[PDB]
Amino acid sequence: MNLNATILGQAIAFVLFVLFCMKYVWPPLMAAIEKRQKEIADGLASAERAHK
Amino acid sequence: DLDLAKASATDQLKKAKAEAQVIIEQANKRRSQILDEAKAEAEQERTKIVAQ
Numbered sequence: 001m002n003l004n005a006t007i008l009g010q011a012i013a014f015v016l017f018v019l020f021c022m023k024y025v026w027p028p029l030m031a032a033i034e035k036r037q038k039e040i041a042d043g044l045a046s047a048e049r050a051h052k
Numbered sequence: 053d054l055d056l057a058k059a060s061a062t063d064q065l066k067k068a069k070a071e072a073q074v075i076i077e078q079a080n081k082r083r084s085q086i087l088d089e090a091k092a093e094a095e096q097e098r099t100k101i102v103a104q
Contacts, residue, residue: 050053 046054050057
């Protein structure tokens with residue numbers, strides 16, 4: 001089709017959605033998941049210590 | 053489990069500690085029985101030998 005100034009405009013929108021997603025969306029979600037996964041490991045350790 | 057392992061640890065400690073003392077105390081009862089018997093019959097023997 002036709003190449004256009006839209007190629008630069010979309011490149012501003014793309015970078016800024018990646019920067020707000022990188023700071024705000026991703027670190028608080030993955031801290032919250034890993035904080036659950038970690039506790040499951042803590043429960044397993046406790047079962048081992050109890051038996052011993 | 054993190055609680056039954058605690059409860060059993062105190063349960064064995066209590067029972068084992070009492071029996072170890074009971075054993076050694078009645079070893080002293082046996083010792084003093086043996087000594088009392090010997091200390092008595094030494095004269096029961098001598099009082100027979102002078103009558104002889």
